[PDB]
């Protein structure tokens, strides 16, 4: 077992052996962005693809072109941490080698007239942190993946558009990655159409007329030929038997002197085999039968040279006679069956008014650019640039792949330009689907939906920037000078940087990280949205998109999704899901060969899945790997049934493969309704990290992964033995073999103490190791905000009893004891930021100073000399935090103030106070002050003090850094030197720098000694050089906004405690607003006088069907029960052997549990440490759909000598008499949500008023008033209360004279209203009057 696991082993009730360990949970973000950067040599991705896509740029003439060579990412100015403090994007410079070649236009290709190579700077690109995030403007943002319609061709068909017709009508759509959509469709009269750029409908064949296709070629392409021979007697027709399906004989078919089909009957399939066996070639056809058929090609009068019958025209008797007259002895017609080969292209050609290529191009032009008189070259260029230009059209690799998949073509790759073959094939397959062979595609299928991650949208935005650049580069290359133009001259970083900086900071998909919890982070990074650019809209989204789809199984979670207006659009990646090289989700499966369930794992997409038959993870297996049941439950073609054991192709990997990471942490998920599982998964994210983190007694074994893979903890980079643990750093001395040859082998982790999160919570880290104890690679060295020894811990477990209590648990209310508030176990720290900016006004600079007018020494007691609070000062609402006073000018006062100031002789100062003070209702402890000053403004005294302290601590930190590293290095030197010459007196008494030139026997000893002499050289160079670098960074100025002289940021730290109103919840979707903090002596108490921490309603469970919370409760009471046994063994100081026996008995308990832990291999110290960690209750793992069963729960309850019914006799706390019938009591894990009533309570009597409408709207301290909407106006109209309404319209909101007059009346003690007319009404009158419409008020 692992070191961090040998100290607290969670008992696992899983039964199915796990065969694939969960992947790194953030690989989507990391892999995507690493594609976006890392230099692709060949298979263009990311920056290389964008450059090769735009460059080279040829000038409009061809005299010169701008050429691309390579790119390189410079080092970021400041690290992630420095950017957080300074508030600046964590980016890296992009530096692109470029070449300007200039050709001579006299000589043919006189290339060497000018060659000009120069590295140019274009844009900065933000970099991803090691945890899948970006530090943009100091705030940590996440860009969520996108699920969009994969590029390619989609055949759809709407049913009942013309509802009177009730006729399904089809359409095909070509959606390129970049470019113009192309939409073929039918219409109720079976007429094909093309809708370019959602413009007007055009007869579809017109597009073919734009591609050099004459009517003969069109009909040669789309139809099938029927041959007529005028064989000297009445229209002998060559017959192909297979064309004779499903027809009626309107004349008697006779060949070889034999009548096969009798006239008047239906042609039958027996007749067709008759004709095939008889090998009939030719049948006589009557001349009246041809009056309906249509001629294929265009037949001329070859006797004279004139035309007879135009192509695609219906033959008649006279036309047939004329054709026979002119020596035409072979005739072609079109096979137009009403069943299988409809006359679609023929009818469309017939309704098409165009007759040649130019007229079709002109029609295209007039549809695309209506009003503009088209020309030859304009029309030709427009149509060619539509689809056949590589710049304005890209189907992309995925697009060409999906296109050929929906065209059954063989080659995966191709070209991003539409061909003629492609439009022809799309038309042909749409015609097929109209006929009946093949069928439409469904859009919700996850083989037609694709994931665009951060690397790919970033690449797209970078390419858009490069286009913006190439415009002006072409403009400058065509006209401007040549020999005096370096490439650096003609590039502008602004257009490129603006594009990338708009995506990373202002995109809909680029959004503030949810940092309420380690789970909330790690599930914001696995989100998958269907909004933003190229996505849907929450109000124009349908129903088919929202509902689950059978292909979501293993790719997207069915449970976790917001339950507001974003119900189905936003959803979370499943646990084991991945993305193909084309962006399609895929899920692992064990291959099955010969019944045996193999160990090798194939990732199947959503399309290569369907045709296989996939067994389930619940299906039992034997040692060999064979199934046990004969009829294994499997699913195939998107639907499930029972199959044989040898008919099975694949198996699922784990029973948690269908759920996401947040729903994988709910225990007993299978016992809860999916409505409550949805709510539980959603609320589990908002849990606030409490003061002390406590493991869940019942978890699902997935907590360790969510904690270690969030990067909220400090995992060891390499093994070794801890050298120095501190509250704020862990120095670990690496093992010998894990140590690279040249370096000291000391890893230093600087834990991040109390730091604001995005949500004003506390990101704190606490070492969980002890000095001088071994550690291995991957071992958690420091807990995070909401972890506990490496396991996630979003909330705390406490004694819940399910029973009503005097109406204090009515309708989801929670009755919480007071022993829960005394123990400060749901107390949360809330760090807050307050900022005061000193600005240059037109009346002069504003000053931050202690001397504040109209304020006594009372308030100024806490400010230091420069006017900034001390660190540690416990402030309360209203206390001054920094003293800022602005220049003030002539204040027009009233004669009475004139008299007042001229009597007491007190003229107010010319300086107004705008000092920053704590917002009302807030207490706290100033824990940090940061001062930012321009580069050019003198630093006040406290800025200098802060600068000195930070400089000194930084210098000391670097000194300790190098001191520890070189101490370990001198240890390495001594260790190598005890080999090959051990010296006692001379070797130690020398200062350790006495090896810079001294030499000993030539082995690896002196080799390392010379290595470390060079290390002396360049590491002194390092020490002083980069120490001066940090000194410069510390003392350098700041790029503040224009007009800002200095900014002071003060960091309170509130400590919020439970109170009535704070929403709590559990993992099973059972919310609750705490109703009463009940005294300890009143809680229902057990038979041993131990009271009950929380009392929950039993009427919440039945109609909600979250039975899990019951089972969990029972299991919790089992787990804690075991702890008590162990507690009574450690408090009675019983031998390690007695504890080992009992603990071992407590692990090997389940039916046939997967886990087996053998305590014979633990040393007695390890057993005692494990027992110390279990004495608060033995934690238990209950995997999601492989849980623990009531048989095992009750064996556990019997192990801890508890009531196997899981339900005890509670006595009342107040009257002391037993509750009549037993109550269920056990430890349920509760979470304090983010809905703290401190933040939700708000009130207002009077305050700010908006500017235009003159109606309540504050927000800074006192927020805007309560909106009294239309529905409430209806309610008051219903009551008949006209006066309450009138005051809520005029004097409470808009009536200015009214509002102030009535404040005066209230203060006088007279409650009366003098209402006028609201401001918004006569604002409306002005706005209507400004439309030239004379609206007035007909006075009396």
């Amino acid at each position: 077992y692992s070191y961090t696991e040998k100290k607290r082993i969670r008992k696992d009730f899983g039964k199915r052996p796990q065969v694939l360990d969960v992947p790194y949970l953030l690989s989507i973000q990391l892999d995507s962005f690493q594609k976006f950067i890392e230099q692709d040599p060949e298979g263009q991705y990311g920056l290389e693809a964008a450059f090769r896509s735009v460059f080279p740029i040829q000038s409009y003439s061809g005299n010169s072109e701008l050429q691309y060579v390579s790119y390189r990412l410079g080092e970021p100015v400041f690290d992630v941490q420095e950017c957080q403090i300074r508030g600046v994007t964590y980016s890296a410079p992009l530096r692109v080698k470029l070449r300007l070649v200039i050709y001579e236009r006299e000589a043919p290709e006189g290339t060497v007239k000018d060659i000009k190579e120069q590295e140019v700077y274009m844009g900065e690109i933000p970099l991803m942190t090691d945890n899948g995030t970006f530090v943009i403007n100091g705030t940590e943002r996440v860009i969520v993946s996108q699920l969009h319609r994969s590029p390619g061709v989609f055949f759809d068909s709407d049913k009942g558009k013309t509802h009177s017709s009730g006729k399904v009508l089809y359409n095909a759509r070509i959606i390129p990655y970049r470019g113009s959509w192309l939409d073929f469709e039918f219409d109720p009269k079976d007429n094909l159409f093309v809708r370019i750029d959602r413009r007007r409908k055009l007869p579809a064949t017109i597009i073919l007329r734009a591609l050099n296709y004459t009517t003969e070629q069109i009909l040669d392409l789309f139809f099938e030929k029927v041959i007529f021979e005028i064989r000297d007697n009445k229209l002998q027709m060559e017959l192909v038997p297979e064309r004779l399906r499903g027809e009626t004989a309107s004349f008697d078919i006779e060949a070889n002197g034999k009548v096969y089909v009798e006239k008047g009957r239906r042609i039958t399939a027996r007749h067709i085999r008759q004709l095939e066996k008889d090998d009939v070639k030719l049948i006589e056809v009557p001349v009246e039968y041809i009056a309906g058929k249509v001629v294929a090609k265009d037949y001329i009068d070859e006797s004279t040279g004139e035309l007879i019958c135009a192509a695609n025209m219906e033959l008649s008797l006279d036309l047939l006679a004329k054709l026979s007259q002119s020596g035409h002895k072979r005739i072609e017609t079109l096979f137009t069956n009403d069943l299988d080969h409809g006359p679609y292209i023929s009818e469309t050609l017939r309704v098409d008014p165009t007759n040649d290529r130019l007229s079709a191009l002109v029609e295209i032009y007039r549809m695309m650019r209506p009003g503009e008189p088209p020309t030859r070259e304009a029309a030709e260029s427009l149509f060619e640039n539509l689809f056949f230009s590589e710049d304005r059209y890209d189907l992309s690799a995925v697009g060409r792949m999906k296109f050929n998949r929906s065209l059954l073509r063989e080659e995966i790759e191709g070209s991003g330009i539409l061909s003629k073959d492609d439009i022809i094939d799309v038309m042909k397959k749409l015609i097929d689907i109209r006929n009946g062979k093949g069928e439409v595609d469904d859009i919700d299928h996850l083989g037609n939906r694709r994931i665009r991650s951060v690397g790919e949208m970033a690449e797209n935005q970078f390419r858009v920037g490069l286009v913006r650049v190439e415009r002006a580069v072409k403009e400058r290359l065509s006209l401007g000078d040549l020999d005096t133009l370096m490439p650096q001259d003609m590039i502008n970083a602004k257009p490129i940087s603006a594009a990338v900086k708009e995506f990373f900071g202002s995109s809909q998909l680029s959004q503030f990280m949810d940092q309420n919890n380690p789970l909330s982070e790690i599930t914001h990074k696995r989100r998958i949205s269907a909004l933003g650019p190229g996505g849907l809209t929450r109000e124009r989204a349908g129903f088919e998109v929202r509902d689950v789809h059978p292909t979501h199984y293993g790719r997207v979670c069915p449970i976790e999704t917001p339950e507001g207006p974003n119900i189905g659009l936003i959803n979370s990646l499943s646990v084991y899901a991945q993305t193909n090289e084309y962006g399609f989700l895929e899920t692992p499966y064990r291959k099955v060969t010969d019944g045996v369930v193999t160990d090798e794992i194939h990732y199947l997409s959503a399309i290569e899945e369907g045709n296989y038959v996939i067994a389930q993870a619940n299906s039992n297996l034997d040692e060999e790997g064979h199934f046990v049941e004969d009829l294994v439950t499997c699913r195939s073609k998107g639907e499930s049934s029972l199959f044989s054991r040898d008919q099975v192709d694949y198996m699922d990997v784990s029973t948690q493969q269908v759920v996401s990471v947040g729903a994988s942490l709910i225990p007993f998920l299978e016992h809860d309704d999916a409505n409550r599982a949805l709510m539980g998964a959603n609320m589990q994210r908002q849990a606030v990290p409490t003061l002390r983190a406590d493991k869940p007694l019942v978890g699902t074994g997935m907590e360790r992964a969510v904690a270690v893979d969030s990067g909220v903890t400090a995992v060891a980079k390499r093994g070794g033995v801890v050298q120095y643990v501190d509250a704020s750093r862990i120095v670990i001395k690496v093992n010998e073999d894990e140590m690279y040859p040249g370096e000291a082998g000391i890893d230093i982790y600087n834990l991040t103490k109390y730091t604001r999160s995005n949500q004003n919570t506390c990101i704190n880290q606490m070492p969980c190791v002890s000095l001088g104890e071994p550690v291995e690679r991957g071992d958690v060295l420091a807990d995070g905000p909401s972890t506990d020894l490496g396991e996630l811990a979003l909330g705390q477990n406490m004694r819940v009893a399910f029973m009503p209590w005097n109406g204090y648990n009515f309708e989801d209310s929670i009755l919480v004891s007071e022993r829960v508030v005394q123990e400060d176990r749901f107390t949360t720290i809330h760090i807050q930021e307050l900022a005061c900016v000193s600005r240059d006004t037109k009346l002069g600079p504003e000053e931050i100073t202690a001397d504040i007018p109209n304020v006594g020494e009372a308030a100024l007691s806490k400010l230091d000399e420069s006017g900034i609070v001390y660190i540690g000062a416990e402030v309360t609402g209203g206390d001054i935090l920094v003293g800022k006073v602005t220049p003030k000018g002539e204040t027009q006062l009233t004669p009475e103030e004139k008299l007042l100031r001229a009597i007491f002789g007190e003229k107010a100062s010319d300086v107004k106070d705008s000092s920053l003070r704590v917002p009302n209702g807030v207490s706290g402890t100033v824990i940090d002050v940061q001062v930012f000053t321009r580069d050019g403004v003198e630093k006040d005294k406290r800025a200098l003090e802060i600068e000195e302290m930070q400089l000194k601590q930084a210098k000391k930190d670097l000194s300790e850094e190098l001191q520890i590293l070189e101490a370990g290095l001198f240890s390495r030197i001594r260790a190598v030197l005890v080999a090959g010459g051990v010296e006692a007196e001379k070797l130690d008494k020398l200062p350790r720098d006495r090896w810079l030139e001294l030499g000993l026997t030539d082995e690896e000893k002196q080799n390392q000694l010379e290595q470390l002499a060079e290390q002396y050289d360049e590491l002194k160079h390092e020490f002083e050089k980069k120490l001066e670098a940090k000194r410069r960074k510390i003392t350098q100025g700041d790029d503040l906004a224009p007009g800002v002289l200095k900014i002071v940021k003060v960091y309170l730290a509130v400590k919020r405690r439970i109170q009535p109103g704070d929403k709590m919840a559990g993992r099973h979707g059972n919310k609750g607003v705490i109703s009463k903090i009940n005294p300890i002596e009143d809680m229902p108490y057990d038979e041993n006088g131990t009271p009950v921490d929380i009392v929950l309603n039993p009427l919440g469970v039945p109609s909600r069907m979250n039975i899990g919370q019951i089972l969990e409760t029972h299991l919790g009471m089992a787990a804690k029960g075991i702890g008590d046994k162990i507690n009574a063994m450690l408090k009675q100081q019983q031998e390690v052997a007695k504890l080992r026996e009992f603990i071992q008995r407590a692990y090997d308990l389940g039916a046939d549990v997967r886990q087996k832990v053998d305590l014979s291999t633990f040393s007695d110290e390890e057993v005692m440490r494990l027992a110390e960690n279990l004495r608060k209750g033995m934690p238990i793992a209950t995997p999601v759909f492989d849980g623990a069963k009531e048989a095992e729960i009750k064996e556990l309850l019997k192990l801890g000598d508890l009531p196997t019914s899981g339900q005890i006799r509670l006595y009342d706390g107040r009257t002391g008499e037993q509750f009549e019938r037993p109550v269920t009591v056990g430890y349920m894990y509760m979470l304090k949500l983010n809905h703290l009533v401190d933040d939700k309570m708000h009130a207002r009597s009077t305050g700010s008023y908006s500017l235009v409408t003159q109606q309540p709207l504050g927000g800074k301290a006192q927020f805007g008033g309560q909106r009294f909407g239309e529905m409430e106006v209806w309610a008051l109209e219903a009551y008949g209360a006209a006066y309450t309404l009138q005051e809520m319209l005029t004097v409470k909101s808009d009536d200015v004279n009214g509002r102030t007059k009535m404040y005066k009346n209230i203060v006088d003690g007279n409650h009366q209203m003098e209402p006028g007319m609201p401001e918004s009404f006569n604002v409306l009158l002005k706005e209507i009057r400004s439309l030239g419409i004379n609206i007035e008020l007909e006075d009396e």
Partner: protein, 61 residues
Amino acid sequence: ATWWIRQAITRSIADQARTIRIPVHMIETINKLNRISRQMLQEMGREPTPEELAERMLMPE
């Protein structure tokens, strides 16, 4: 014609196109700063600070 047309267009784009009218000469000075900022940006690799920008454009900070 080109000389006069460019004059009229670039003088109107300064007289109008701004909500708070900037006088023509101040517009020209702003554009001087924009050009010089571009070239210093690509020369250095960072946006210039007003000290260096003043030093280049030859007028006080």
